[PDB]
Amino acid sequence: KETAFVEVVLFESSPSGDYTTHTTGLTGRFSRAGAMLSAEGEIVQMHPLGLCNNNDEEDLYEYGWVGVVKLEQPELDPKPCLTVLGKAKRAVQRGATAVIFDVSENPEAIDQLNQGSEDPLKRPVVYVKGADAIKLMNIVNKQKVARARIQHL
């Protein structure tokens, strides 16, 4: 597990057309379920039950996005439609340039993710926890939009 430098980027436009941007850094780790590649894209929150095969024609999202998934304590859903891998893989199938798992509730996932070395996806898969997780989620719940930039150094 190499360390994932995740820079969440808030931005303003102004009447003159220009942008100012500032940067929260968080830290996570890349899993073996996905590449050691940096990624960057618009952040989109994916609910956990909202990455499954079962939905036939799910909602459409612009390609090039960043999944952020808040996993819970595993007994809150004991019969999940997929594994963490299956969701990471779905996301990527549906254009995620990368996925950020907030595993705060379920440290178990880290293990599940690196066991999926057999299929390691095109795109990177980051796990984050702790205060670093808090920041991300609050950015999500408060901010209108934002931009994630995941770095592998």
């Binding site: 994916m46 808040k70 907030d102």
Partner: protein
């Protein structure tokens, strides 16, 4: 807070619904949070499931809103609504209502 909710989280909204109600994944911009709803909104229809009750995508031709898999309510503009289905012109043995998008 999160309403109609059995298990719930600050971030994902509703995780399990009270049994009668339907689970709806709503987008408010960046967030997508669970909701527990009585009626699905326009463009959707309720479904009772053993796993859980769930609000599904109204997949049917030229129909803005529907009640079921294949029963329409309001058709999209210029389509005439008869018998739960949407039609281009009103069908043989049927006639469009005055001032209405509805046949007879």
């Amino acid at each position: 807070i999160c309403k109609g909710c059995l298990s719930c989280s600050k971030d994902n909204g509703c995780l399990r619904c009270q049994p009668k109600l339907f689970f709806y994944l709503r987008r408010e911009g960046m967030r997508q949070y669970g909701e527990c709803l009585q009626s699905c909104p326009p463009g959707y229809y309720g479904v009772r499931g053993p796993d859980m009750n769930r609000c599904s995508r109204c997949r049917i031709e030229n129909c803005d809103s529907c009640f079921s898999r294949d029963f329409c309510i309001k058709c999209k503009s210029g389509f005439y609504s008869h018998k739960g289905q949407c039609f281009e012109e009103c069908p043989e043995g049927f006639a469009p209502l005055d001032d209405t998008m509805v046949c007879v």
